[PDB]
Design an enzyme around this catalytic site. Structure first.
Site, mmCIF file in Angstrom:
data_model
loop_
_atom_site.group_PDB
_atom_site.id
_atom_site.type_symbol
_atom_site.label_atom_id
_atom_site.label_comp_id
_atom_site.label_asym_id
_atom_site.label_seq_id
_atom_site.Cartn_x
_atom_site.Cartn_y
_atom_site.Cartn_z
ATOM 1 N N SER A 52 -0.769 15.478 -12.143
ATOM 2 C CA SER A 52 -1.010 15.088 -13.518
ATOM 3 C C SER A 52 -1.254 16.340 -14.350
ATOM 4 O O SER A 52 -1.802 17.332 -13.868
ATOM 5 C CB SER A 52 -2.211 14.150 -13.585
ATOM 6 O OG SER A 52 -2.612 13.884 -14.913
ATOM 7 N N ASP A 64 0.826 -1.204 0.000
ATOM 8 C CA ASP A 64 0.000 0.000 0.000
ATOM 9 C C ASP A 64 0.860 1.253 0.000
ATOM 10 O O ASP A 64 1.342 1.674 1.048
ATOM 11 C CB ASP A 64 -0.914 -0.019 1.234
ATOM 12 C CG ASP A 64 -1.823 1.186 1.319
ATOM 13 O OD1 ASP A 64 -1.951 1.900 0.305
ATOM 14 O OD2 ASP A 64 -2.428 1.380 2.404
#
Length: 330
Positions: free
Chosen positions: A199, A35
């Site tokens: 992004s 994770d």
């Protein structure tokens, strides 16, 4: 040193991935959920409340000659999906794919929430976010990666998750045969303890690319792709009959649909998520309404590039002095 381990979907939907981890002496192999959005290595154990164990493999520290109780240490964690766990702490030898750390904090669960109990395939989590998020008290502990870093050939790990197929986590090297083209690296903020990046935009299907900054986290421990409501609405508008269902808890779509791809930007590069990666199947057994793999982050408070996004790429988690993230097509 290096390590390399195969990671395997837990079910036919790729709801999560499990990777075998050797703990203790002699080794006890547990299948952990790696994770990158948390920083605790915790396991089902011989100390876990019996009624809360249902099929998981447990760590028994009393059977490990290298286990040592970390005196006075406790831990308690709550995850974004509302699940939680807590307990005490041992140090022990932990190996992943041939890479060994001695003195790793292994957090032994005394209690786990129902979602963990109900998932027989996940024996615990191995956190790979920054150690500043580790919950051990009163002395915070380091992640497996943080402990291994100085010994690694290069201070990196990579995630290569498969679509409906196994993939690989590598530590200490970049497998140049595992991706196509080049790796595009992008800046990371560690301010919130995550692999947080920006992004450069998105496209839906064969549509034009929209240049827009989307701050979010690379999180292998989250199944879906959570993005701003504007982006998510633009995606589902291209699927006839798709709608946001408050009762179901997100966007659903007719199972008869063909889903468009979704592209996200990494600098000037583009990662394409095929439409099929966005199908999470019937909302309940036998239903013709299917659950979408792109959902709104509104009210999460952060955008999450979870497995839906990451499995479309070869992803480098670069833990150099100034961390960065790399993405390649594959």
């Amino acid at each position: 040193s290096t390590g390399s381990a195969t990671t395997t979907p837990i079910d036919s939907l790729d709801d999560a991935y499990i990777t075998p981890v050797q703990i203790g002496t002699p080794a006890q192999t547990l299948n952990l959920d790696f994770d990158t959005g948390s920083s605790d290595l915790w396991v089902f154990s011989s100390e876990t409340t019996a009624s809360e164990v249902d099929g998981q493999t447990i760590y028994t520290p009393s059977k490990s000659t290298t286990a040592k109780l970390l005196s006075g240490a406790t831990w308690s964690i709550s995850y974004g999906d509302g699940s939680s766990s807590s307990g005490d702490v041992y140090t022990d030898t932990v190996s992943v794919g041939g890479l060994t750390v001695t003195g790793q904090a292994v957090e032994s669960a005394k209690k786990v929430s129902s979602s963990f109990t109900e998932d027989s395939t996940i024996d615990g989590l191995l956190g790979l976010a920054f150690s500043t998020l580790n919950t051990v008290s009163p002395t915070q502990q380091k992640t497996f990666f943080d402990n291994a870093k100085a010994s690694l050939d290069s201070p990196v790990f990579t995630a290569d998750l498969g679509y409906h197929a196994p993939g690989t986590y590598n530590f200490g090297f970049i497998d140049t045969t595992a991706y196509t083209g080049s790796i595009t690296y992008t800046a990371v903020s560690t301010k919130q303890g995550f692999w947080e990046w920006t992004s450069t935009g998105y496209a839906v299907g064969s549509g034009t690319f929209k240049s827009t900054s989307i701050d979010g986290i690379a999180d292998t421990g989250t199944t879906l792709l959570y993005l701003p409501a504007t982006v998510v609405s633009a995606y589902w508008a291209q699927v006839s009959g798709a709608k946001s269902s408050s009762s179901v808890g997100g966007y659903v779509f007719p199972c008869s649909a063909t889903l468009p791809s979704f592209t996200f930007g990494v600098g000037s590069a583009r990662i394409v998520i095929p439409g099929d990666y966005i199908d999470f199947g019937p909302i309940s057994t036998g239903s013709s309404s299917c659950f979408g793999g792109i959902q709104s982050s509104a009210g999460i408070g952060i955008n999450i590039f979870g497995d839906v996004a990451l499995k479309a790429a070869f992803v480098v988690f670069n833990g150099a002095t100034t961390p960065t993230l790399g993405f390649a097509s594959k």
